């Protein structure tokens with residue numbers, strides 16, 4: 001509804017290293033967005049439940065908004081000209097911010113991932129023989145939940161805490177990583193890609209619509225398969241911005257407007273969907289270079305050359321999803337996912353059926369039960 005504070009702030013630029021001035025609006029809902037020039041909400045940019053910290057390194061009058069978002073630590077770093085300015089922002093942000101099991105229950109089998117904020121471990125629950133992923137966050141580094149009712153997101157089974165740790169026991173699919181399946185197969189057929197794309201769209205529609213959340217981390221590495229061959233979108237983020245690549249995320253998948261470090265929204269997920277589906281259908285990334293600066297330039301400046309092997313529906317969809325201007329991009333309007341759901345490439349798809357897992361997988365991984373360790 002209402003703006004509580006507005007004005008310029010220096011924001012640490014994540015991908016193209018800079019302190020760029022952004023015009024920010026703090027709002028009564030918790031929203032805190034920074035536009036390049038003086039200008040539906042997203043919980044990703046909210047300050048609700050966040051931790052505010054004053055520091056003088058690297059620059060004087062710096063502050064940090066650190067948030068635990070679901071199971072992931074998200075940080076943004078800001079700088080102002082004087083200490084009185086800081087206290088004005090920090091007090092305004094602070095005031096607007098207005099609202100079973102233990103380690104012993106599990107066996108620890110394999111390291112799945114590691115970052116500055118913690119670890120993800122392949123785990124087996126002793127009492128049931130079931131396999132999960134435990135995401136273990138370090139309390140020293142950071143200084144009441146209800147799952148999404150959608151089948152292709154990563155559901156949380158348990159949440160608990162030790163004196164120095166936060167532990168999230170979450171689903172872990174045993175049908176293999178899609179990066180592995182695609183590496184072997186070289187390329188997916190358009191119908192194979194249609195099936196995965198439809199399952200991705202359905203999950204992200206849910207996040208965007210029911211949760212007011214952007215994923216922002218769509219990539220082949222974050223997609224795994226069910227025992228049944230259905231999609232699982234992964235929740236293993238551990239990365240901390242600013243320390244050794246010094247940025248978080250896989251740049252090959254990042255939208256131009258994320259790179260520019262302007263405001264962005266739901267359409268960043270559709271750009272991600274475009275890269276992912278392009279990769280499944282062409283067997284290669286749409287933008288690639290060894291050197292990150294050159295890769296960034298390509299994402300921002302270069303138009304794509306689409307292979308001649310691609311049917312006209314696929315090419316239309318991919319060209320739509322990979323438009324640089326987010327307001328022009330497929331799914332970038334007020335309709336969001338609906339724009340993509342009624343694109344011609346998905347002709348015939350019954351979206352309630354996708355949501356209900358009624359779409360038949362083109363590929364079943366070689367696994368007899370949810371307890372099959374073959375892919376681990």
Ligand SMILES: CC(=O)Nc1cccc(-c2ccc3nc(-c4cccnc4N)n(-c4ccc(CNC(=O)c5cccc(F)c5)cc4)c3n2)c1
Nearest residue numbers: 043044049068069070153154213214215216217233234235
């Ligand atoms: C108090 C609180 O938790 N707030 C909050 C703020 C923003 C998002 C969320 C939230 C809620 C439910 C969620 N479910 C998923 C999810 C997504 C995919 C698969 N399984 C899942 N369970 N998310 C979720 C998980 C990971 C991410 C990854 N985040 C980023 O990579 C990211 C990085 C920089 C900026 C940014 F906005 C996002 C985003 C959302 C969720 N995020 C919660």
